[PDB]
Amino acid sequence: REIVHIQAGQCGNQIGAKFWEVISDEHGIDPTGSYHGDSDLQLERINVYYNEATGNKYVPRAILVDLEPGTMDSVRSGPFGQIFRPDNFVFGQSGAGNNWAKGHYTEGAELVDSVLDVVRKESESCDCLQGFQLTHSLGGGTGSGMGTLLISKIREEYPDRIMNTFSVMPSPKVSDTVVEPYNATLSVHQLVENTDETYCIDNEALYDICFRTLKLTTPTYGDLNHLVSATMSGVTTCLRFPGQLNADLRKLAVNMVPFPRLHFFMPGFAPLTSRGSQQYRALTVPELTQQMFDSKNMMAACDPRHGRYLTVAAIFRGRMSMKEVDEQMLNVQNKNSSYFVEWIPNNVKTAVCDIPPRGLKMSATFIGNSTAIQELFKRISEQFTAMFRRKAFLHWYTGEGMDEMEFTEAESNMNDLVSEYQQYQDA
């Protein structure tokens, strides 16, 4: 069951590269593409993400996309820059100017067919393609605008495949431009309709974690991407290593998505660590379970106590007592049963994987579908409305052919999504 990976825009390519860097190390693949590991667990399902090449070389099934060559040139000169298939580098020259319209309708529409040629070339090599995963931000132009354009066209050509995304949400605390709420709202509209699974990665939460918890006075994007790569590794563990639970993208979707539009997940992770800062003390299982559920460990700036969990997927990594894990997992549900919907019996599922990530002897990754996620979309909607009520900064969009009505629809659909999440919070 092969997965085709796509990374779009500056953010998309910067976390996308970091992702391939991290899991390549876990699968024992060096920058050359050669395997140098000591466990056979590493190679059993390496076909999910890697293509097998001459000399038993492994090549990521990854497609790199951008409307400017800057970031992708940095990727190609980065640590694992050479592992990527050079033909899978598809880039324009004009950029998107943090403009959704440019990415979706003009600049990106010019490039999108070239990208789909590569997607198609990769897909036909697959014995049994299960689907796609996209990494991108929603606050810019390329990843947000062209990324959702790609999603729409992939769904057209592969309507029976799963679409998955890692979507970075914009935050004023970590902001490039004022129009990020516009770009994000337009994108969420697209995501609600055309993805089955979306990991909501909030730059607000990533900032707060770095500041409040990791005590980083002034966090960079590099710091923020330490958390993202750690989270991305964890939520894909069940897909990359042998196991019985949530092993493919469809079975994850069937277990996590009770209603088709409500497919926006809160990722969580424990223990939280900063770059370089060495951890010497391994956490106990009770500690991992408590932390991975705490709001301070959520990658989406939402209070889980303000909502209810529809579904939960948990993945413990390392050498530990699987009996202690099940005990602690059952304790959380039994002590805080109110925060789990009673009309989905046994909605918490747990997996365990012997291989821990690098630098930690054990870890836990959390994937929650909570109604509390509405707080994320409400926040975006408020920032959106503040500007839109005065039609501020809209000329950037009307200049590319967009009409005000399209903003109104996007606004309305996100507010509908909010109310849908609220409907089940009071069930």
Place this chain on the structure above:
Amino acid sequence: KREHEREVIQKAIEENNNFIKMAKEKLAQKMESNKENREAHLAAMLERLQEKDKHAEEVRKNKELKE
């Protein structure tokens, strides 16, 4: 959606062309209007000077019919 996508980029092209078009026409009209006005001002000037000549002829004429 594909049809909407086409309509959006067609709208951007249309409005961009319409802006170029109206700027080209607005300018051509101004330079034409300015050419007429300046010429009409210079023409009125010469005409006034040319009747000073006609007046001078009438004066010299009046001196010959003075004798």
